[PDB]
Amino acid sequence: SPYLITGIPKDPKHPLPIRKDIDDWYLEQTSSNRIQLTLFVEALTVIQNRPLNDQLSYFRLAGIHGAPWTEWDGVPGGQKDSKGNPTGFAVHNNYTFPTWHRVYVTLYEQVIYEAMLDFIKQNVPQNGKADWENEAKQWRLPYWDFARFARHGGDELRLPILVTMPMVKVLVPGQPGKQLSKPNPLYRFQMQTLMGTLERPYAITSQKTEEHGWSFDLPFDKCQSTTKYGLLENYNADVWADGGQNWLRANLALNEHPWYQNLDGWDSVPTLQDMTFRLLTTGGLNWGEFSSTRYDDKKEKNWMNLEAIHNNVHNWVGGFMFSRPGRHDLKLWGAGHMSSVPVAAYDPIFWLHHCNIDRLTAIWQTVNSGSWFNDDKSKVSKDDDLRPFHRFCEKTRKVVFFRSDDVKDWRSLNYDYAITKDASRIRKEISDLYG
Amino acid sequence: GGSPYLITGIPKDPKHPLPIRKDIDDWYLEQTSAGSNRIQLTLFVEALTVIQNRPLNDQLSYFRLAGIHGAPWTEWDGVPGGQKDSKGNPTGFAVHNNYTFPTWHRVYVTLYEQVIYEAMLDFIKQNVPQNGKADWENEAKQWRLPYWDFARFARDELRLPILVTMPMVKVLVPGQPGKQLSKPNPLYRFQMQTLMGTLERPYAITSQKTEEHGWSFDLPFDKCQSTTKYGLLENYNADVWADGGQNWLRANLALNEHPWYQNLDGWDSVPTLQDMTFRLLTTGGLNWGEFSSTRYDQAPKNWMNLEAIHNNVHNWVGGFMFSRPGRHDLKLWGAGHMSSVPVAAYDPIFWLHHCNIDRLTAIWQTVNSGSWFNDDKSKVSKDDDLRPFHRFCTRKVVFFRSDDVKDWRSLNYDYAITKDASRIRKEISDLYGQ
Ligand SMILES: N[C@@H](Cc1ccc(O)c(O)c1)C(=O)O
Ligand SMILES: N[C@@H](Cc1ccc(O)cc1)C(=O)O
Ligand SMILES: [Cu+2]
Ligand SMILES: [Cu+2]
Numbered sequence A: 001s002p003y004l005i006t007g008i009p010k011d012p013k014h015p016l017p018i019r020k021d022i023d024d025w026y027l028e029q030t031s032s033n034r035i036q037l038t039l040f041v042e043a044l045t046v047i048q049n050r051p052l053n054d055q056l057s058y059f060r061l062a063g064i065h066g067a068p069w070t071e072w073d074g075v076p077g078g079q080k081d082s083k084g085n086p087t088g089f090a091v092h093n094n095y096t097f098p099t100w101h102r103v104y105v106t107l108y109e110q111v112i113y114e115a116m117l118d119f120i121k122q123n124v125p126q127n128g129k130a131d132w133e134n135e136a137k138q139w140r141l142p143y144w145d146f147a148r149f150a151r152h153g154g155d156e157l158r159l160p161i162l163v164t165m166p167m168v169k170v171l172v173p174g175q176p177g178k179q180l181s182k183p184n185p186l187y188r189f190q191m192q193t194l195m196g197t198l199e200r201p202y203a204i205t206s207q208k209t210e211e212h213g214w215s216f217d218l219p220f221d222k223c224q225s226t227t228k229y230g231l232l233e234n235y236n237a238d239v240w241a242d243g244g245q246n247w248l249r250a251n252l253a254l255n256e257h258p259w260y261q262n263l264d265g266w267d268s269v270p271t272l273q274d275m276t277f278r279l280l281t282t283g284g285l286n287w288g289e290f291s292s293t294r295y296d297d298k299k300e301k302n303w304m305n306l307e308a309i310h311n312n313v314h315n316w317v318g319g320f321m322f323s324r325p326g327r328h329d330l331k332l333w334g335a336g337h338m339s340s341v342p343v344a345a346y347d348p349i350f351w352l353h354h355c356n357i358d359r360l361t362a363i364w365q366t367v368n369s370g371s372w373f374n375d376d377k378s379k380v381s382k383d384d385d386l387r388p389f390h391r392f393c394e395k396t397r398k399v400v401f402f403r404s405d406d407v408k409d410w411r412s413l414n415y416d417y418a419i420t421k422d423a424s425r426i427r428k429e430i431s432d433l434y435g
Numbered sequence B: 001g002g003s004p005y006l007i008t009g010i011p012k013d014p015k016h017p018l019p020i021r022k023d024i025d026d027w028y029l030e031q032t033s034a035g036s037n038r039i040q041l042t043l044f045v046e047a048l049t050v051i052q053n054r055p056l057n058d059q060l061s062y063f064r065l066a067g068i069h070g071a072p073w074t075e076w077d078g079v080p081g082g083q084k085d086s087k088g089n090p091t092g093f094a095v096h097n098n099y100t101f102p103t104w105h106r107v108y109v110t111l112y113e114q115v116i117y118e119a120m121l122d123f124i125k126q127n128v129p130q131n132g133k134a135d136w137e138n139e140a141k142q143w144r145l146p147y148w149d150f151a152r153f154a155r156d157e158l159r160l161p162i163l164v165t166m167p168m169v170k171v172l173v174p175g176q177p178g179k180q181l182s183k184p185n186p187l188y189r190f191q192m193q194t195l196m197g198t199l200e201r202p203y204a205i206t207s208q209k210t211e212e213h214g215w216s217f218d219l220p221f222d223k224c225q226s227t228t229k230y231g232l233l234e235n236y237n238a239d240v241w242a243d244g245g246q247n248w249l250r251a252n253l254a255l256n257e258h259p260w261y262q263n264l265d266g267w268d269s270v271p272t273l274q275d276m277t278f279r280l281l282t283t284g285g286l287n288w289g290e291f292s293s294t295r296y297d298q299a300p301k302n303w304m305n306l307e308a309i310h311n312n313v314h315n316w317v318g319g320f321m322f323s324r325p326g327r328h329d330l331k332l333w334g335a336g337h338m339s340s341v342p343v344a345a346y347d348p349i350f351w352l353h354h355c356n357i358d359r360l361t362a363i364w365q366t367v368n369s370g371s372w373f374n375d376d377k378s379k380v381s382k383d384d385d386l387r388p389f390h391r392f393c394t395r396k397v398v399f400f401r402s403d404d405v406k407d408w409r410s411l412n413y414d415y416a417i418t419k420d421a422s423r424i425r426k427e428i429s430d431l432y433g434q
């Protein structure tokens, strides 16, 4: 420490590699080689199995966001949210929501790439290194396009293919023709014990949430594994230890789009795809309005801001009803990690979601040049330190925290998105995907 | 070695008179409570894991025992497979749509229970400290196959068993008090080491035809490595199909929404699964033909026979919609093994479901003691051989017959509800009455 966040280093043979749609990428891989898939699976597996005292373990990286609310990279915890409760470093309900998360996703991608290089050095024979290093240097964190209809070989939105597979096949380096089935590190994350009993100070507690005006303590302390919808009130806690990846219910929620906001008076109740379309194409919006639920409290007009859409998708992926609803809403009963700020980052889909939130931000920036922390509301937050993320400042030759202006051009972090490559094409592509 | 496997039930020990098959949730809760020694849960898990890991050429492997019922339609215990139905299609030894449905399945469930008990005794011989073997053996001798009470509200909701919904389960380390080990739960699913369509001949599991909204589909069971509940959806990548998950929330939703496949036009009301089960056990005046099978049937209203309720529960547990349905039915989309006759027995819940179907039969017998293969319709099937199941008779080995298992107690098990016959109508009302 400090861990200096840069994005994957620039290699002249690999100009601005793209973050791809994780379903397109998965099909590309499994149509037509499996080297990037193998690298991602093997590297993330290593990262997930690193110990708690390693701040580049999966648990500690996920820990930056929320619970257990500890230090990271020499930056102390002890932060409080608006309710006065313990909270993480993540920015929610402020205009730095997109930029804090832009750095967070790049940290994750960078840590994964560094683990891929270690993998290659240790497992790929000389004859194969050039090719495998080429693939690592081209790889970027895929995004989950939650607003794009899934292909058939599409009419509905879905969690990623790879997220729904408990096992995945990878290559055996230096044994061309050979493959192995391994547990898929994108399917879930689990510790070796209930997360509530981890050594101090890392234990994950239950998390108090409101449902229909009443308080419930979501039993995340009783989980060994992350779950989607697997936690239900008055179920045996042995079920809670691993409540499953109930991906059919997440898919149901995505297509039923039960927005939590009051849409009384709206022109229509949009689908998730249409709400995303409106976000990207409504004219005349400023950075404050686009970026955060903070801009307009009482909205928590025929369009919804980035953070509010993102909040709904979190709920719909993780499950947002622990207590049993009325009979007419039983089809969506169940709670899980992605709906809960303190523990959502433990679910590996968190990062894929946030990769698309970053992509949506980049699209919006592209077609709203100049709208950046400069309205009357968001200007105060422009120069906030994005703790706990450190970088080396070239000008001054100092270690400093990231600030939002440092990541205004996401290309400075050495990744891009296909959709933002050609500004002559982007408006057509937005209509093709989401209109 | 020319030796038929005789099905007897667990052997009689006079200090263990007619042990009971318990409700699997009660049993699991007891086993995991501080006042229990946890030995039966350990033995069940360890024995069923061994049985599941036996090779295909072992006829007492899980795959081969599940294979008796349906696909891949091979021989078992020297009795030839490769049978064909009326329509000309492959069919297994299982009896469906006939009045021997309950008795064929009574023997099948006993076979499973017996193989498990024998594997428990092997585990004890090899893994338990000498001075604990007598205690562990006595627990094995008390153990019987638990039943899933699909019509009883969980501790108001019907639910799959607690234990069936757990991917992992903690068991004892014999001789090391307080020490437990988490292991893959053999009741959660069954899987092979490859996709089941690629197993060595003659064992490969093929796709299975199903009709949905008037169209034929291939349910892609050949592309599954694991059994699934609801995990097979049309137009999903086949890598999802390899293991489509145990989507137990959807199964529970189906149990409580009870989308009966039958036309209920003219019915006084649409009963829940608990009320339909109540009516099965309490409607008087029915004969064995009417109770036992879909074959008897135009149909009666406000009542359903045993086999028809059982069929619905199969569909609701496994998932019965592969192709995408209409908007209103999206909440129950997805297909899985338990809804398909050829492959349902591979899902470990199959046996727990049939244990309760055996229980419901025993209860009905108890309150209908004079009705047994003795109406005009069912009488002709009474003396059917229940292939492939052998027993010793005259000193010859023969096939089981329905009359050999009229008294289930001859197989050395009982149920709490039938052992206490004096209370039985009050117990049916307390459990299942509205
Ligand atoms: N559940 C939150 C949304 C949310 C959940 C988890 C998160 O990590 C997050 O950033 C936002 C809401 O209803 O508004
Ligand atoms: N699909 C059957 C139900 C069933 C399924 C599997 C079985 O093994 C038996 C019955 C029906 O609709 O009637
Ligand atoms: Cu966040
Ligand atoms: Cu988020």
Ligand SMILES: [Cu+2]
Pocket (backbone or CB within 6 Å): B069, B094, B095, B096, B105
């Ligand atoms: Cu059967």
Ligand SMILES: [Cu+2]
Pocket (backbone or CB within 6 Å): B310, B314, B353, B354
């Ligand atoms: Cu059955």
